[PDB]
Amino acid sequence: AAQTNAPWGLARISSTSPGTSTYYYDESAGQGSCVYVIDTGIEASHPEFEGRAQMVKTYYYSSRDGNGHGTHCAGTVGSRTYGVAKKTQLFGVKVLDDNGSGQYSTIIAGMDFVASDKNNRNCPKGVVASLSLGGGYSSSVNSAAARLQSSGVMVAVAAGNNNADARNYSPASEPSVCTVGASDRYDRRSSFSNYGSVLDIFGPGTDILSTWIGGSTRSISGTSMATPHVAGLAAYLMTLGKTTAASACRYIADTANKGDLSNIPFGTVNLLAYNNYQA
Ligand SMILES: [Ca+2]
Numbered sequence: 001a002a003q004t005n006a007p008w009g010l011a012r013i014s015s016t017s018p019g020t021s022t023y024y025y026d027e028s029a030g031q032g033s034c035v036y037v038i039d040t041g042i043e044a045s046h047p048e049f050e051g052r053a054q055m056v057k058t059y060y061y062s063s064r065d066g067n068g069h070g071t072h073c074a075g076t077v078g079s080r081t082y083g084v085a086k087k088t089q090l091f092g093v094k095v096l097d098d099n100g101s102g103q104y105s106t107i108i109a110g111m112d113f114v115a116s117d118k119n120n121r122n123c124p125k126g127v128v129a130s131l132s133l134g135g136g137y138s139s140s141v142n143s144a145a146a147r148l149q150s151s152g153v154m155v156a157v158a159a160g161n162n163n164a165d166a167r168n169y170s171p172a173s174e175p176s177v178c179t180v181g182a183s184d185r186y187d188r189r190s191s192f193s194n195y196g197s198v199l200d201i202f203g204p205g206t207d208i209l210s211t212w213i214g215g216s217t218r219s220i221s222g223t224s225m226a227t228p229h230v231a232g233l234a235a236y237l238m239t240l241g242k243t244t245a246a247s248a249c250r251y252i253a254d255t256a257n258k259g260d261l262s263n264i265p266f267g268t269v270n271l272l273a274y275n276n277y278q279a
Pocket residue numbers: 175176177178179200249
């Protein structure tokens with residue numbers, strides 16, 4: 001399948017080179033997988049989700065995304081137009097309030113909640129979680145990420161937005177999950193991407209067009225926008241039979257475009273998420 005004049009990040013993760021705008025992909029498009037977006041929620045009523053998105057948990061007084069962040073992430077995972085895995089089932093877990101912020105203990109609560117709930121959902125092809133959030137190192141936050149991963153969920157986490165080595169940030173530093181940095185449409189590391197040997201992979205994160213609340217769209221930027229490109233991609237790869245929730249971060253690294261980002265500080269991977277469809 002091909003989708004012309006695509007947001008640029010969807011073309012990138014289907015390209016070897018930058019500078020094009022079609023998204024080439026297999027039509028199975030993540031059918032039969034599932035992705036949890038653990039964030040401010042998901043405006044599931046956005047027609048771009050076409051009935052495939054459900055809130056299923058909140059730790060606040062409403063499950064609605066009243067911020068838009070969670071809705072934008074989720075759109076990149078699996079909206080019809082702006083998504084990677086255009087036919088995956090989405091699930092929302094509102095651990096962030098509406099300004100964006102969340103205490104660690106609630107973020108922990110929502111992470112253990114996915115390891116349990118996946119057992120209440122129909123995900124024959126695999127299950128993913130997408131965490132576009134974080135804050136300073138915590139053993140506990142990190143441990144809640146290893147559990148979620150260990151429970152057979154592919155966990156994708158934002159490396160962080162300070163340009164700082166991410167080993168000081170959680171859940172990014174947690175080694176057993178898949179820590180994602182951001183790039184730009186000219187293959188530069190985005191100016192705000194954390195970096196450091198705990199990263200596994202980069203995806204698109206600078207000027208990422210996706211859904212927003214009010215039925216709407218916007219382009220915003222972050223390792224947060226990069227993260228749901230890897231999550232959606234892993235859903236897409238499960239479904240295709242290429243990899244498994246426990247093997248997907250290694251498979252994506254193995255199949256990445258290798259060398260191609262400029263400003264990888266020394267010691268940081270220079271691997272860019274690629275779908276290995278058109279070549
Ligand atoms: Ca890893």
